[PDB]
């Protein structure tokens, strides 16, 4: 049902805000964003920036992406972005996460015609 492209929106696109509100900011979105439906899933960050942004960095750095695949690009420029990782307590189904939010490259893996993000690597 979902396309990679609709599905890395949903994973890691919060432009509804320009950085995380409170130290609850994860906890609420890894729920929202069905994240924590049926595991908690452990790591995931969310950019605060326009999709064309965004997608413009599948057209940036080319770089080799964690698994060694070629299809990861760097932006060029730092973004907004909120960082999410589940504490060592967390035990579903109570997902629990620290949050941090910070300004620093992004590392996206792009798919598709559009180009566009279908995999968050790393930020930097």
Do not use: W
Request: charged share 20%; aromatic share 8%; net charge positive.
């Amino acid at each position: 049902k979902e396309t990679c492209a609709a599905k890395f929106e949903r994973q890691h696109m919060d432009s509804s805000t320009s950085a995380a509100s409170s130290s609850n900011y994860c906890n609420q979105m890894m729920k929202s964003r069905n994240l924590t439906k049926d595991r908690c899933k452990p790591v995931n960050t969310f950019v605060h920036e326009s999709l064309a942004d965004v997608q413009a960095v599948c057209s940036q750095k080319n770089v080799a992406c964690k698994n060694g695949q070629t299809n990861c690009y760097q932006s060029y420029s730092t973004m907004s972005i909120t960082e999410c990782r589940e504490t060592g307590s967390s035990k579903y189904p109570n997902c629990a996460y620290k949050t941090t939010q910070a300004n620093k490259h992004i590392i996206v893996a792009c798919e598709g015609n559009p180009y566009v993000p279908c995999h968050f690597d790393a930020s930097v």
